[PDB]
Amino acid sequence: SFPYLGKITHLKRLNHDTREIQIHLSRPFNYQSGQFAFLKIFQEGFESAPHPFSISGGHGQTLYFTVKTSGDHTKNIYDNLQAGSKVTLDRAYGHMIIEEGRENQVWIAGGIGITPFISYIREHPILDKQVHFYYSFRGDENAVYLDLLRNYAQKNPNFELHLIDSTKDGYLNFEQKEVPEHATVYMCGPISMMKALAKQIKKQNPKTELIYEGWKF
Ligand SMILES: Cc1cc2nc3c(=O)[nH]c(=O)nc-3n(C[C@H](O)[C@H](O)[C@H](O)COP(=O)(O)OP(=O)(O)OC[C@H]3O[C@@H](n4cnc5c(N)ncnc54)[C@H](O)[C@@H]3O)c2cc1C
Ligand SMILES: [Br-]
Ligand SMILES: [Br-]
Ligand SMILES: [Br-]
Ligand SMILES: [Br-]
Ligand SMILES: [Br-]
Ligand SMILES: [Br-]
Ligand SMILES: [Br-]
Ligand SMILES: [Br-]
């Protein structure tokens, strides 16, 4: 096969350091919520090296990515990326597949780790599972998609949101927190957070299925 050629149709700054990219693809793309792709940007003043970003929405020929400023290239995306610029993508990657889990699920996002969960929400307007969603962010200035999450909970009573400001309450802690074996736990966020929560959940709940995707923030 060959790369997907895409054109950026929209850009939205969600907060002080996070920007959503909407792309239109040359042909239909296939992925499952929880997966990521390597994006190459073709714009003057940008490096064309590929960077992995979780897919945050879309179906058919539309794809969304949500990028948080974490260094030179992602700061350049926040300040200077333009609509109309073209990108290339290879295929979807990743083994975290949210749809494959049990009908009861616990989702845990740390900061920009919310992005695969946003794709699931966007692709399932009527939620088919019972979900407890723990979204932890460093202060109110670093939260994204709060209105979207509120709208989803209003439309789907089976979606239970738990917003955590880690600057007020400290990092999310699941020590001795019981998670039943009929639920699947999905997590995405900083690798430091994923490894601490995974040790806590595995020890208290050895029988509970736990799947996560982490990256060095
Ligand atoms: C599976 C996966 C999914 C991700 N999803 C998202 C997402 O939805 N939103 C988001 O904002 N960020 C996401 N990231 C992180 C993102 O790829 C990095 O923040 C970004 O590439 C850093 O580029 P930079 O030039 O700004 O920073 P740099 O100056 O390159 O910062 C260095 C750090 O950035 C990361 N990084 C740099 N280059 C790469 C690379 N080629 N491959 C992997 N990591 C790299 C590493 O953590 C590294 O320690 C994801 C990363 C992975 C691995
Ligand atoms: Br899916
Ligand atoms: Br779409
Ligand atoms: Br290419
Ligand atoms: Br893969
Ligand atoms: Br955050
Ligand atoms: Br929103
Ligand atoms: Br946290
Ligand atoms: Br980290």
Author numbering: 183 to 361, 362A, 363 to 399
The authors write:
NADPH oxidases (NOX) are transmembrane proteins, widely spread in eukaryotes and prokaryotes, that produce reactive oxygen species (ROS). The cytosolic dehydrogenase (DH) domain belongs to the Ferredoxin NADP +Reductase (FNR) family which has motifs to bind a flavin cofactor and a pyridine dinucleotide NAD(P)H. Thus, the NOX core catalytic domain contains the necessary machinery to move electrons from the electron donor – NADPH – through the flavin and heme cofactors to the ultimate electron acceptor, molecular oxygen, to make the ROS product. SpNOX purifies as a monomer and is constitutively active, so it represents the minimal functional core shared by all NOX family members. Here, we obtained X-ray structures of WT and F397W mutant of DH-only, and of a F397W mutant of full-length SpNOX.
We reasoned that changing the corresponding residue of SpNOX to W would stabilize FAD binding and inhibit NADPH binding, thereby reducing mobility of the two subdomains relative to each other. We interpreted this to mean that W in position 397 prevents hydride transfer by immobile stacking with the isoalloxazine ring of FAD, while W in position 399 has little effect on hydride transfer. De novo resolution at 1.94 Å of SpNOXDH F397W was possible because we co-crystallized in the presence of sodium bromide and collected a bromide-SAD dataset. As expected, SpNOXDH presents a typical fold of the FNR superfamily of reductase domain containing two sub-domains, the FAD-binding domain (FBD) and an NADPH-binding domain (NBD). In the asymmetric unit of SpNOXDH F397W, all molecules of the unit contain a well-defined FAD. These observations agree with flavin contents observed in solution and support the hypothesis that the F397W mutant stabilizes FAD binding. In contrast (and as predicted from the homologous FNR structure), the tryptophan of the F397W mutation makes an extensive and much tighter parallel stacking interaction at a distance of 3.5 Å from the isoalloxazine ring. Trp at position 397 appears to preclude access of the nicotinamide to the isoalloxazine, preventing direct hydride transfer. In line with conclusions from DH homologs, our data suggests that the SpNOX F397W sidechain represents the position that would be occupied by the nicotinamide ring of NADPH.
